[PDB]
Paper text:
The C-terminal domain forms a stem consisting of three membrane-proximal helices (E-H1, E-H2 and E-H3) and two transmembrane helices (E-T1 and E-T2).
MVEV has the highest fatality rate of mosquito-borne viruses endemic to Australasia34 and is thus too pathogenic to be imaged without inactivation at most cryo-EM facilities. Like WNVKUN, bMVEV has the typical structure of a flavivirus, where E folds into an ectodomain, a stem region, and two C-terminal transmembrane helices. Given the high sequence similarity and consistency between the MVEV and WNVKUN structures, these differences are likely to result from ambiguous electron density at the lower resolution of 4.3 Å for the JEV structure. In bMVEV and bWNVKUN, Lys16 from M forms a salt bridge with Asp28 from the opposing E subunit, thus stabilizing the dimer formation.
Author numbering:
A (entry chain b), B (entry chain a), C (entry chain c): 5 to 75
D (entry chain A), E (entry chain B), F (entry chain C): 1 to 501
Amino acid sequence: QTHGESTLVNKKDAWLDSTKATRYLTKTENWIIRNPGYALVAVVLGWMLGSNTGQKVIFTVLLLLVAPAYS
Amino acid sequence: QTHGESTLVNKKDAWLDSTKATRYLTKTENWIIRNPGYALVAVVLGWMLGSNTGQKVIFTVLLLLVAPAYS
Amino acid sequence: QTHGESTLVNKKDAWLDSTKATRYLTKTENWIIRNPGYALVAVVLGWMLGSNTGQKVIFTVLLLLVAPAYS
Amino acid sequence: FNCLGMSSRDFIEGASGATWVDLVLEGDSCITIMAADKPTLDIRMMNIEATNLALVRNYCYAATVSDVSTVSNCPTTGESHNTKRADHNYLCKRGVTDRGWGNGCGLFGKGSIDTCAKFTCSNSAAGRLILPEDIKYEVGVFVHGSTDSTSHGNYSTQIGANQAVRFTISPNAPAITAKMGDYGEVTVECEPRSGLNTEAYYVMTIGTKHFLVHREWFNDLLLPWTSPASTEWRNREILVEFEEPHATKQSVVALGSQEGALHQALAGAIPVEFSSSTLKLTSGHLKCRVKMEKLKLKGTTYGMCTEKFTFSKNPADTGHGTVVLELQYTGSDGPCKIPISSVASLNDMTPVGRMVTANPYVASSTANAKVLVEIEPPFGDSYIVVGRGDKQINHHWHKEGSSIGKAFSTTLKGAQRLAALGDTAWDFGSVGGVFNSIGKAVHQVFGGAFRTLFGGMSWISQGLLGALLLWMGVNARDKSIALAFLATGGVLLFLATNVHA
Amino acid sequence: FNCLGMSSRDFIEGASGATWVDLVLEGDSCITIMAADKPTLDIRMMNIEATNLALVRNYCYAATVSDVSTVSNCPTTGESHNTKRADHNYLCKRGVTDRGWGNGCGLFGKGSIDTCAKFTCSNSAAGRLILPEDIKYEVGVFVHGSTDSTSHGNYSTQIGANQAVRFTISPNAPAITAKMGDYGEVTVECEPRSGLNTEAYYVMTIGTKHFLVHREWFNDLLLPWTSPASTEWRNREILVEFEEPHATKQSVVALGSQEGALHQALAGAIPVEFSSSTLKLTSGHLKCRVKMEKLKLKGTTYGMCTEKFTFSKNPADTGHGTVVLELQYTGSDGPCKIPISSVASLNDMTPVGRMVTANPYVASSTANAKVLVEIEPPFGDSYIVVGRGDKQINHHWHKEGSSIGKAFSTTLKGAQRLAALGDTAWDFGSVGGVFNSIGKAVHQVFGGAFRTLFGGMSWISQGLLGALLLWMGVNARDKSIALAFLATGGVLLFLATNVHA
Amino acid sequence: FNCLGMSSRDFIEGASGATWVDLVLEGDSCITIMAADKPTLDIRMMNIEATNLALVRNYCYAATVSDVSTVSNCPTTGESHNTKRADHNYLCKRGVTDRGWGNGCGLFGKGSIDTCAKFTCSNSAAGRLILPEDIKYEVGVFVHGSTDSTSHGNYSTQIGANQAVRFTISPNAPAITAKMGDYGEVTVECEPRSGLNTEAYYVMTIGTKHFLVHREWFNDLLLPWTSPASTEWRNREILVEFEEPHATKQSVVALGSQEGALHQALAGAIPVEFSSSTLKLTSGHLKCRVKMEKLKLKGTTYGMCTEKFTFSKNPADTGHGTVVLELQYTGSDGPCKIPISSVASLNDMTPVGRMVTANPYVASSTANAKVLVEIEPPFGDSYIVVGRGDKQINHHWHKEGSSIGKAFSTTLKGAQRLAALGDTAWDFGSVGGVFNSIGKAVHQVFGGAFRTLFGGMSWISQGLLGALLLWMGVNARDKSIALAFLATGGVLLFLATNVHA
Ligand SMILES: *[C@@H]1O[C@H](CO)[C@@H](O)[C@H](O)[C@H]1NC(C)=O
Ligand SMILES: *[C@@H]1O[C@H](CO)[C@@H](O)[C@H](O)[C@H]1NC(C)=O
Ligand SMILES: *[C@@H]1O[C@H](CO)[C@@H](O)[C@H](O)[C@H]1NC(C)=O
């Protein structure tokens, strides 16, 4: 489990500040690149049970986020 | 990124098999216990958005799973 | 990438004052002379792509400008 | 080799018309073939051996940082360049500080800064690639004859009796004809190259521990890696961090050894044994087509033994439905056939359970000779009658389970084998292939899409996706798509539960 | 101390007729206080010092395993129950291995095996807590007198001239009054214990590095931990792995280390300096109130000078909207006040730009003296005029800014301050009133709910949730619900972007 | 200095009530100030002189590769990593080639190869940054008096006559007063810092020719560029081409000198003069505020001349509507005032056209003296009458044009000045009126969006956009959008046609 952003006011950088924009995305992007075939699965699942187009997009993005970071 | 279950046919156990049922759930459960206040947020968001009871339950569990495992 | 007209107030002539009216046109005119067959394609696409008469002329001139200056 | 004391044991019936049998022969599992008239065969793949492994990448999991120097410039001038950047082995990263008149600069703003750190790697987790032309499967073949319990497993005694012979199956020798003294010769036409997919596995060594990782996983590690026989490292800014931009002197601290992170990352890796550049792992399978054309039962059959038989070891169930017992023959009548059978009751002496051992006999002519006998009694109460007349050793035996339970267990085992082998499972225990060929083709077609859509997804994710598919298919309108979604969800749930998580 | 060359600088103007002004006094954020007639005061909290810390736990990242012994039992004969399980400092795990006649047993099946290993931990990552009474701040106060730029930042010359002092704020010494040469006595009555909450922070010592981690995160680590001054390691099976259940033997292996996993896990941890049990961190905040009733000007008796002022150092921009210039007094007229002001043009010479260094004056009577001056020119072109007549020296300055741009930047900085500080941000630069108290109460009553709902959420998760809330609100039929969802989504998106990731 | 025979010379008439006017002082565009009674003076800034420039980026345009070597690796063996890659100034790039049995490899396929070439830069184009403080504009002020035509252009004579004087205007001294022998003092209040936007301009040096280029353009070039005082080049692959990947060897050739490409790329770059690190460009504008409070007449004490005046040189037009003539005095009565005026007709003898050279006279007492007089006759026929009686010498002049034509000409000139300046053009001749202030404010507001929306488009693209806007506006429905589009399109083509291309 990562520490996360400390609630203490710190105008300087934390222990890891360079990876602040990568720690939560490298795993997801590498998994998506690893098996890109799953991308269409989320799209079709959203289009099937999605009552509204916005709902379809929401379901697609939620599935594409759930699958890499398991649980 | 975890290695995951190997594609080889192994009758024996892998390098880590005792934690096979925990490596994907301990982080989520520890995060949920840490801030249980989010649990009602996902529940109400699913309930007030789903046009069907099953859809609402799906959205609730999807958000409650998205939150701990970022992306 | 060309430098373009400088924002500094200069009553003199810039580094290349003679070619100010040719740097942006010689390539296009050489290309359209070397490839006169594209003109019919451009006008046909412009006529088809628009319904209003003025829109057709705009489409034709825009495509005829696009083709020599790629992207 | 011998199947005695093996957790996984499967029996394949041998049709009289069929002369060849196709079996997967998966590692750490014993396959026993029970032919009608030919002696029973049991083949077990011991291990897979490889040699001459070549490096691919050398990830570093423990870095050392020292000799830190810092050069800074005024805000107006460009980014500073430290003189140590020209020399290699020095990780240099630029940065920005704040400069003022007190610091010595003539202007205020975001002054630049550059620092260096001598980067040295202590130990590296080198990865190696296994060439398909080097793997050497070791396969053992055994025929159940007259074997003592202590000798049932000792290869030297078995090869002395010309019953069990170990042969190494390599791409240069895919077929070996095993010669036996009296049972004939059994020929195997196994395909070693298609068995282990050496194009999708590395051999990652972390200190003393060796593993077997995938192609994609080992190439996606976020560690400073170098090419083989290369001093210069690449992507060194991972194990080394810079604490805070300080104009006077910036502190550079290296992260601790990532050895534990690698071990935690190797959740599903298969540990192997590496010594003197000799890989030796046991997992994997080789599709063998065993030809039992020349395999024959001994023509000469000896007379029944008449002396008293004593149980050296009482009948003990092996858990596969077969009973293993050892008989000590008190007399010395030379070669004779043991009068042992399994009967439903003492009233009817017709044997009801097939004998795994082919015509058990006392080969030795010396007294107190011990012979191991394996039987497969029928379900329910049964009697293991050894000998006949006034010397028969009647021994009651109760076998748990029923025919329906055995059928369900076999179906579950077949489903697990199909899940754990893919399309190759349709080639297990196949003799005709009239219906298995189309089954294998359709399974390949489905599996290609299944691995394309899902691929390497965790068991929990597979279970969640299967549950979602079931929920959205039970409410589906069209029957065809509903059935397809139900089947896909069932497959996902079975795969999730197959991991026993 | 001096706000010169500081990343963040805050300018506040004291309300007329107000004796005191409240300020949050952020760490490493020098704040300048300007009054109607009091000398300019800049207060900066240099660092926080704590002593006599106590341990709470001892997590282990490196473990050593030896003395591996195992005992095995026959199948269906109970568990092994190794004798070393009661023996402390021995980790034991029970597994199941298949046993047969080859292994020496009498029966067949999964025979239980219990393996015990000596768990010795080489290195421990001790965690400590900060006592609320031992934490003492260190606040430096300065008065903008006349000093050379070289000596402006040097503390020894300032403490010699009594223009700057360092005083410590402790729970039993909340109000400390510091006397100066002639400017008076500045009273600093602040609450130290209510500034930084030490009831939610731990000091974690991983080898040589030290960090300031949360209490909730430090107690949820999955590592072998013990209470202080004890060797009883609990939950220690994480660092020890049992390779494979083998007959009468089971080799066990421990993970090499866990420093890398810990360092990667300390994403947002705040590094601190720890030496001789004396904590020293430069971050944090301290809600402070400063009473300037006793503060008074110096040198107001002196008249204007009658010599030429020459710019020894060219004026420079601090980036916060204030220019810093250095003046050299050519004449020798003893102490005198410099007639320097910022005007919109030379024809009108009306003072429009406020001057940070209130009432500059040449201190020494030497022929050549250097005085540093800080001004706040108005937006657009402006002239820095020093005196009148033929002896005046003029300088032109054109700061890049606009009133609308200044307002937007101030709003953005205030929003960032509110996000970073929270409830205490409403007390920044506040002299009192009903508006500030009501705003602080509302902010507390909303931020409590916000933190309960979103306590450990990451910026990416916060951004996604904010986007989802906005998309739900734009589709919401109810006006009040839509407005509430829009506000919540905007707050979440702003907080996510505040991390700048 | 003087403005005889110079194009773009704009006369300005100060208000009688006012005594100070604001000018712009364009580059090589003199402006003559005509006061009601005060002597007319013209100020023209000569050049902008800077110094103490600092390097920012040293681009390279002349590569030279040598010592090319290659290392090839067999397929499925790893990357090559040529040993010379460790040394710097050795560009390396990895490629993939075809390997075979003839190439010496075991298993053939797609191999790996890398090539190392010693990259050395022969000629480097160095860019420099101008510090805003260092620029010191040079402004020359000339007062029209008794000046011979030959001595009018000589700077030494005017210094001797104490009429013209050169002073340098710098941010360290924006306001400087001029010394005249008898005309009093002239005080100007120019703003040098806001004159040239030195923050957005560099000084690029290509060989022996130096150019003043934009900030954004110079930072977006694609060439091997190094930080100042840094030997290590960066982005070197642009000037190096690897032609043929062959296992035996790979040919590396450096591209030709990019010196011509840069010159072709410098379309609107402004050439400058560089010597001893002293930038000298004559372009740019300097807003000023010239005060003539102390400016007084000379020669009013002299009496009128008695002898006859002969035209030494025929009157010649200037092109701006003024006439320059030279009068030769035959007698010798000491310093005397020349009676000269322009009359509409000879029966009136009433001066109708104001004289640019106010109060002409003959300073020298020599028998023959030459005096240059500049007049501004009205439109149509005009007579230049000198003296009266029998000694009167006449001359006819015909100023072709009309008041309406001159009105259109000055409107077009003002439009060009607005286009070439922006908001500073509203400070040309203003006396601080409210109309000019609001005009400049609204012009700044519009121009910010105009430059932000249309940053660096070429002249032809601006014309095309203006034509499209006109076509859309003439067919628009709503009146507001139609008029807005019409105005924007008109501005666009005015800008496109302003460059005269
Ligand atoms: C097999 O039997 C021979 C002869 O009794 C003995 O030397 C050998 O050690 C046995 N094999 C094993 C593995 O003990
Ligand atoms: C401060 O001043 C003292 C005496 O003037 C000098 O010895 C010391 O070096 C100075 N320190 C700094 C940091 O300038
Ligand atoms: C200008 O006057 C100087 C006298 O100082 C003389 O030497 C020179 O020839 C004159 N003419 C020019 C063009 O300089």
